Amino acid sequence: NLQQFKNMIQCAGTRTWTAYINYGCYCGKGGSGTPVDKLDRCCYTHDHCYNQADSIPGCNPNIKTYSYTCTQPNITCTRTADACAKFLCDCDRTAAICFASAPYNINNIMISASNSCQ
């Protein structure tokens, strides 16, 4: 679920989910071209992860509630038997950690309409 992803982000990192709304070519809705940096790669993977979650029965990325715990900065996915939840918590956990470890190039906010996302 998207609110759980929002919370994972600020669990694992200093930057909240709003930092990422407008970043690079892939962070936020949609995406085209080459991911510009490490962080843009994080979003590119996550983007594809959510897309691959539709291939699991009864699985929607935005609405699917899973089980996780946050021991700041640590995220733990609790689900084993529920494959959709297990998969989805993983997409989200992977990205929250990816976002936290990746450098934030302020130079790469607001570029989606430039020649770099081409």
Ligand SMILES: [Cl-]
């Ligand atoms: Cl999309």
Ligand SMILES: [Cl-]
């Ligand atoms: Cl498939």
Ligand SMILES: [Cl-]
């Ligand atoms: Cl379905």
